[PDB]
């Protein structure tokens, strides 16, 4: 019936765009010596695995979070601890500092994204609003500005967030698997998220529209960002291997793997250059790549376990990661 | 020294969280941490109102231990990518109906999913408090209807005694890491009394037997 | 936010009395207080601080041994116990909200004073202007000088900027010599070399008239200058 006559043309559909990238392929990119990072601070106070960490965008202050129900707002230079935020929910997965320092959102198990608010005339750090609506868990959210949030979850969709109102204006469609990972433009105009199909998505969020879908990776994707200059992504997936997508050629550009590394990848994040590409393991480190040749250029190690997440200062200063053994550590 | 009167003053706040955050650790360390899976349709929403939409939390004081309970259902999403997050649970309560038997049966399913539980990577030595429900329906089904269609190789008399006894053996063998884990197993129905005293001994027993391993006795 | 002061009154000199200062509106117990006394035709003196937690505690040498300062947190009431009152503790004494974290801004709030009659190495700093005539509409520049550097070795500078309206406590202008408090228009500006600071209105509003506050918060004791008038 018309099941299987639009089968057959999305059939025929999928070869065009296959041909239409093969066309492209006349170049690969395959066609930074040694990097020794130290710890300089390590910051301690969490009594649980870490499950997220963001930058804000001083430098200066991180905000994490971790299954002992908390939240902390960090001093990277002091180490002190500037805010600690009581969650009522332990079973937090992401959370992310607002670009302008007033908020911060956090959420996970119980499907909502909470936004609180630093900067209040009580002096203490309150919820303003609970963005309820996801069915599945909150896997990550990532704030555009003060009244616009992106959250992506377990339910296999991502959604665009109107804060005051508490509203989904924008609900993105069209992953099949649970969604693993956001990140933005350096713009703010389009999303990339990953999941467990093992392909990424190409975002207008303006629109709904999915403009691109990004296939490749043998397991599910557990993290993606953005080359600095909006042009291209890097992934990392279960199948071990992190992978470079270009988005002007709609194809994959490089892949960045190795013989020893059978574990996931749990994190991806670049340098300002772009020229290193940092990886979070199952193997308690993290790699640096050479994102331009795929050579490893260096190893992150000091965790006593799986390293959960990882972060990139944007003054390109220093590079956080956080762990399941409970510390972030602060490299440079 | 070194640092300016606000620094100072900065300082003392953040080591005044570090002791709220140390005061709260050390109580949550004493709270007993239990992980509500099972079958669809069966005895979840019993066990939580005997003992008594994202993750629900539920809470419960018996004999001065105090508990928290976490209902995963609801969450229908991929299990591989947050069940670790219960790794350190004391213990998982697991319900199974005793009637699965004559209903793929709901049985089959529900052996299934003990077994993915039971031998996961990251419950390795999390101790199971398994409750085998609606025992009363099961002996009014059981006489009429044999454990035969869902075991066929079971040759015993078609009453609760041997039928249930056999039930509870059939899924206590799904233990692949008997030398870890045990599987506690209780036989209850809608009206009990003493759900909350048999959890709560199970978990004194994965209490003692825990810390015969911190300890070094192992 | 709110701060009621109290335990005013006159008292006859070695006697004693107790101030109060009960608050409410905010997270009390996470703030630091301070208490800040204005003698009838004076500029401001501190005269002493207790931390959130009541871990530190300093005292003007002015009332060192003389003062205790203490809070009941449960209450939300901040106290000051003075005893061998002088003649020289005639003042307005205000209670002061003080919170400190990375980001944070430091006296920030007044509340509205008590009037205490009694009857009969610091850094320091100068305003050397006690008063500017002015109009509506135009650009006052408020200078200060340090007799040591504000600029630490952190990177702040820490000079702060307060203005008191006739009949009206001290308002927070500015917190970092250059970082202007919340609720504060943007007519209000400054900047400094470290020992030279300067305040900016770019166009003076009527309701700006007053006297302004120059503010050391280096190191304890803090102080301030004589104050500068605005004549409107």
């Known amino acids: 019936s018309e099941l299987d006559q639009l089968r057959q043309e999305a059939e025929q559909l999928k070869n065009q765009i296959r041909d239409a990238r093969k066309a492209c392929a006349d170049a690969t990119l395959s066609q930074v010596g040694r990097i020794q990072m130290r710890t300089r601070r390590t910051l301690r106070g969490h009594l649980a695995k870490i499950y997220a960490m963001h930058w804000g965008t001083d430098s200066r202050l991180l905000v994490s979070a971790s299954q002992d129900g908390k939240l902390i707002i960090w001093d990277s230079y002091t180490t002190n601890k500037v805010h600690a935020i009581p969650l009522r929910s332990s079973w937090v997965m992401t959370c992310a500092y607002a670009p302008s320092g007033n908020y911060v959102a956090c959420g996970g198990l119980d499907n909502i994204c909470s936004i609180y608010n630093l900067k209040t005339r009580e002096g203490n750090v309150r919820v303003s609003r609970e963005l309820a609506g996801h069915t599945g868990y909150l896997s990550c959210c990532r704030f555009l500005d003060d009244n616009q949030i992106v959250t992506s979850s377990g339910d296999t969709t991502c959604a665009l967030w109107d804060i005051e109102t508490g509203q989904q204006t924008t609900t993105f469609t069209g992953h099949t698997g649970d969604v693993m990972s956001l990140s933005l433009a350096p713009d703010t105009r389009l999303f990339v998220s990953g999941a467990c199909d093992a392909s990424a998505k190409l975002w207008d969020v303006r629109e709904g529209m999915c403009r691109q879908t990004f296939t490749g990776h043998e397991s599910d994707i557990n993290a993606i960002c953005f080359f600095p200059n909006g042009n291209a992504f890097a992934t990392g997936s279960d199948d071990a291997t992190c992978r470079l997508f270009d988005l002007r050629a709609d194809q994959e550009l490089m892949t960045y793997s190795h013989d020893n590394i059978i574990c996931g990848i749990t994190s991806v994040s670049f340098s300002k250059s772009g020229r290193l590409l940092l990886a979070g393991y199952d193997d308690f480190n993290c790699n640096v790549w050479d994102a331009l040749k795929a050579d490893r250029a260096g190893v992150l190690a000091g965790h006593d376990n799986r390293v959960s997440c990882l972060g990139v200062t944007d003054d390109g200063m220093a590079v956080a990661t956080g762990s399941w053994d409970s510390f972030l550590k602060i490299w440079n | 020294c070194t640092l300016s009167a606000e620094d100072k003053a900065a300082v003392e706040r953040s080591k005044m969280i570090d002791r709220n955050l140390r005061e709260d650790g050390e109580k949550a360390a004493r709270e007993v941490k239990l992980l509500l899976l099972g079958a669809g349709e069966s005895g979840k929403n019993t066990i939580v109102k005997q003992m008594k939409t994202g993750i629900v939390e539920t809470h419960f004081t018996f004999k001065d231990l105090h508990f928290k309970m976490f209902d995963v259902g609801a969450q229908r999403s991929e299990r591989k990518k947050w069940i670790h997050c219960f790794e350190g649970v004391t213990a998982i309560i697991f319900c199974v109906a005793l009637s699965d038997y004559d209903l793929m049966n709901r049985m089959h399913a529900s052996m299934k999913l003990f077994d993915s539980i039971c031998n996961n990577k990251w419950f390795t030595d999390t101790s199971i408090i398994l409750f085998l429900n609606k025992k009363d329906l099961f002996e009014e089904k059981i006489k009429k209807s044999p454990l035969t269609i869902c075991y066929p190789e079971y040759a015993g008399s078609n009453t609760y005694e041997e039928a249930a006894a056999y039930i509870q053996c059939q899924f206590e063998d799904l233990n692949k890491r008997k030398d870890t884990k045990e599987i506690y197993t209780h036989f209850t129905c809608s009206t009990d009394t003493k759900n909350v005293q048999f959890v709560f001994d199970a978990v004194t027993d994965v209490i003692i037997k825990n810390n015969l391993k911190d300890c070094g006795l192992f | 936010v709110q701060l009621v002061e109290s335990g005013g009154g006159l008292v006859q000199p070695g006697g004693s009395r107790k101030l109060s200062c009960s608050a409410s509106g905010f997270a009390f117990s996470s703030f630091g207080m301070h208490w800040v006394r204005q003698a009838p035709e004076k500029g401001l003196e501190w005269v002493a601080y207790?931390?959130?937690?009541?871990?530190?505690?300093y005292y003007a040498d002015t009332v060192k041994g003389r003062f205790t300062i203490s809070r009941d947190d449960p209450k939300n009431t901040l106290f000051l116990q003075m005893t061998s009152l002088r003649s020289e503790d005639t003042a307005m004494y205000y209670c002061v909200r003080s919170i400190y974290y990375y980001g944070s801004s430091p006296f920030d709030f007044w509340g509205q004073g008590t009037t205490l009659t009694v009857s009969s190495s610091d850094i320091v700093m100068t305003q050397a202007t006690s008063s500017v005539p002015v109009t509506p509409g135009e650009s006052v520049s408020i200078s200060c000088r340090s007799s040591k550097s504000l600029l630490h070795s952190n990177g702040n500078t820490y000079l702060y900027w307060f203005l008191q309206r006739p009949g009206q406590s001290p308002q927070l202008l500015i917190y970092?010599?250059?970082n202007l408090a919340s609720g504060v228009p943007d007519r209000f500006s400054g900047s400094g070399s470290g020992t030279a600071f300067t305040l900016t209105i770019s166009r003076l509003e009527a309701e700006d008239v007053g006297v302004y506050y120059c503010?050391?918060?280096?190191?304890?004791?803090?102080?301030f200058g004589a104050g500068t008038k605005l004549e409107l």
């Open positions: 207790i931390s959130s937690g009541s871990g530190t505690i």
């Open positions: 503010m050391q918060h280096l190191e304890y004791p803090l102080t």
């Open positions: 970092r010599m250059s």
